[PDB]
Amino acid sequence: LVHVASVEKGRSYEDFQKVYNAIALKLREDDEYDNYIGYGPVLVRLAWHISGTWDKHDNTGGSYGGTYRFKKEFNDPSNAGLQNGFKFLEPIHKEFPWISSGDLFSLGGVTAVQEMQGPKIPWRCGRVDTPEDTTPDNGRLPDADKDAGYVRTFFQRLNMNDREVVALMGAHALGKTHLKNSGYEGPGGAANNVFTNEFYLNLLNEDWKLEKNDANNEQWDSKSGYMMLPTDYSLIQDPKYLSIVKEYANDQDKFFKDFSKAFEKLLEDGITFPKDAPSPFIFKTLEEQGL
Ligand code: HEM
Numbered sequence: 001l002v003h004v005a006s007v008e009k010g011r012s013y014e015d016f017q018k019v020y021n022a023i024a025l026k027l028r029e030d031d032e033y034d035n036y037i038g039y040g041p042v043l044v045r046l047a048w049h050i051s052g053t054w055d056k057h058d059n060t061g062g063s064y065g066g067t068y069r070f071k072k073e074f075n076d077p078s079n080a081g082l083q084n085g086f087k088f089l090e091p092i093h094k095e096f097p098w099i100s101s102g103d104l105f106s107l108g109g110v111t112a113v114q115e116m117q118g119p120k121i122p123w124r125c126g127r128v129d130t131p132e133d134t135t136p137d138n139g140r141l142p143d144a145d146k147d148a149g150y151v152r153t154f155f156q157r158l159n160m161n162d163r164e165v166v167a168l169m170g171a172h173a174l175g176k177t178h179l180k181n182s183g184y185e186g187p188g189g190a191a192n193n194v195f196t197n198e199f200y201l202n203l204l205n206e207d208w209k210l211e212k213n214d215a216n217n218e219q220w221d222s223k224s225g226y227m228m229l230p231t232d233y234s235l236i237q238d239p240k241y242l243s244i245v246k247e248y249a250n251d252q253d254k255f256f257k258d259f260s261k262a263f264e265k266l267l268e269d270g271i272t273f274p275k276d277a278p279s280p281f282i283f284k285t286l287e288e289q290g291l
Pocket residue numbers: 041042044045048080081142143144151168169171172174175176177178179180181182183184231
């Protein structure tokens with residue numbers, strides 16, 4: 001496969017900035033979801049799960065085809081709970097029927113991070129919806145019950161190296177795990193709907209205790225009321241990953257700069273951009289626009 005980026009016919013920066021402004025205004029408004037966490041966390045988890053099916057060996061999966069819209073990917077056990085992020089974005093797709101599904105699912109993630117006080121993420125338009133038979137089979141998304149060796153081997157299929165993997169995993173400060181979705185339960189820190197380096201600081205400063213939860217799965221619990229997954233806890237058990245965790249814990253700006261670069265790379269894997277294509281757009285936040 002080659003997947004060439006094609007701009008939605010006739011659309012420019014200001015059209016996309018209107019879809020972003022509409023996702024951000026609805027984030028402001030539906031602030032009660034999941035005990036007042038808001039939809040920001042499930043929207044960046046939707047943007048990474050539609051991108052994480054990519055396989056570098058044959059160019060299949062990835063964000064291009066917007067295939068989550070199909071039953072097979074939608075009903076994938078690893079995608080339980082993302083139906084909430086889909087339902088949120090659906091009125092917005094009726095308001096802007098011209099934007100592709102992959103472009104909308106991925107911009108939902110960019111909007112959520114920037115509106116949660118994260119770094120600016122450059123975003124590129126051009127994904128094209130593809131047929132139901134291009135939909136990737138289930139089982140390409142990662143297990144939580146595993147170690148640092150599995151994590152490194154997994155992220156190599158998306159050719160993400162160590163620093164990219166540690167920066168990307170910093171998004172687990174956001175939101176929480178839910179027992180009925182994944183068999184895990186609990187938050188990862190205090191500020192779980194503001195984007196900060198808190199995941200790293202909690203992983204270095206809490207007194208973590210291994211326990212089984214109500215689903216019979218193990219997780220790392222702390223006195224404070226926080227939890228970490230086995231794969232999260234892996235980042236301080238591996239010596240290469242641990243020097244990077246310490247770097248981000250001492251420097252949130254370096255974390256922002258590296259998360260920005262890696263999240264964009266994750267959203268654009270498997271897509272060729274012609275050089276006639278527009279440069280990546282930097283969207284303004286509501287606040288920047290006075291809205
Ligand atoms: C080895 C990698 C990863 C594994 C095994 C993993 C696993 C999980 C699991 C089990 C949950 C809880 C789901 C639930 O019960 O609702 C979760 C939540 C979440 N994940 Fe990951 N994750 C990984 C990588 C990432 C990456 C790379 C991102 C983002 C760049 C990400 C973002 C999120 C977000 C934001 C949540 C919170 C969702 C919410 O509050 O509803 N994860 N993850």
